[PDB]
Every structure is written in C-alpha cells, then in structure tokens.
C-alpha cells in the first residue's frame, strides 16, 4: 500500500 494506486 501507499495511497490507492500502483503501490498496493
């Protein structure tokens, strides 16, 4: 995770 985008 990390916001709601590529990270998760």
Swiss-Prot record:
Cu(2+) 1 binds at residues 1-3. It is found in: Cell membrane; Golgi apparatus. Sequence repeats lie at residues 1-7. Transmembrane segments: none annotated. It comes from the Eukaryota. The glycosylation pattern (the amount of mono-, di- and non-glycosylated forms or glycoforms) seems to differ in normal and CJD prion. Its primary physiological function is unclear. May play a role in neuronal development and synaptic plasticity. May be required for neuronal myelin sheath maintenance. May promote myelin homeostasis through acting as an agonist for ADGRG6 receptor. May play a role in iron uptake and iron homeostasis. Soluble oligomers are toxic to cultured neuroblastoma cells and induce apoptosis (in vitro). Association with GPC1 (via its heparan sulfate chains) targets PRNP to lipid rafts. Also provides Cu(2+) or Zn(2+) for the ascorbate-mediated GPC1 deaminase degradation of its heparan sulfate side chains. Monomer and homodimer. Has a tendency to aggregate into amyloid fibrils containing a cross-beta spine, formed by a steric zipper of superposed beta-strands. Soluble oligomers may represent an intermediate stage on the path to fibril formation. Copper binding may promote oligomerization. Interacts with GRB2, APP, ERI3/PRNPIP and SYN1. Mislocalized cytosolically exposed PrP interacts with MGRN1; this interaction alters MGRN1 subcellular location and causes lysosomal enlargement. Interacts with KIAA1191. Interacts with ADGRG6. This protein is produced by a bicistronic gene which also produces the alternative prion protein/AltPrP (AC F7VJQ1) from an overlapping reading frame. The alternative prion protein/AltPrP (AC F7VJQ1) and PRNP have no apparent direct functional relation since a mutation that removes the start codon of the AltPrP has no apparent effect on the biology of PRNP. In mouse and hamster, the alternative initiation AUG codon is absent and is replaced by a GUG codon. It is linked to PrP is found in high quantity in the brain of humans and animals infected with neurodegenerative diseases known as transmissible spongiform encephalopathies or prion diseases, like: Creutzfeldt-Jakob disease (CJD), fatal familial insomnia (FFI), Gerstmann-Straussler disease (GSD), Huntington disease-like type 1 (HDL1) and kuru in humans; scrapie in sheep and goat; bovine spongiform encephalopathy (BSE) in cattle; transmissible mink encephalopathy (TME); chronic wasting disease (CWD) of mule deer and elk; feline spongiform encephalopathy (FSE) in cats and exotic ungulate encephalopathy (EUE) in nyala and greater kudu. Belongs to the prion family. The normal, monomeric form, PRPN(C), has a mainly alpha-helical structure. Misfolding of this form produces a disease-associated, protease-resistant form, PRPN (Sc), accompanied by a large increase of the beta-sheet content and formation of amyloid fibrils. These fibrils consist of a cross-beta spine, formed by a steric zipper of superposed beta-strands. Disease mutations may favor intermolecular contacts via short beta strands, and may thereby trigger oligomerization. This is Major prion protein.
